[PDB]
């Protein structure tokens, strides 16, 4: 009944949360842009983060982050 999907991000979030708290912000969001280092940096981070923190609270936790990779499909 169960499937391999949560375990994937479960390990990603742990490594993604360099701040060590449980949520991701503009600071950590850079972790994805750092791989490209394109112009999107210092700009796209503020617009991209909007995807993760789609709760209107001011931070993204282990949940909405799963929607990120979801786009990969």
């Amino acid at each position: 009944m169960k499937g391999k999907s949560e375990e994937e991000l479960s390990d990603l979030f742990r490594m993604f949360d360099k701040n060590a708290d449980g949520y991701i912000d503009l600071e950590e969001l850079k972790i994805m842009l750092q791989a490209t280092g394109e112009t999107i940096t210092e700009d796209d981070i503020e617009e991209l983060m909007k995807d993760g923190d789609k709760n209107n609270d001011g931070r993204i936790d282990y949940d909405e982050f799963l929607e990120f990779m979801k786009g990969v499909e």
Binding site: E8, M32, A35, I40, G71, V72
Partner: peptide
Amino acid sequence: TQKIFDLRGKFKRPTLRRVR
């Protein structure tokens, strides 16, 4: 308009091929 860049790739499944 793109949004996709690396973030998408290498995010399907963890594969490890041993030298064997």
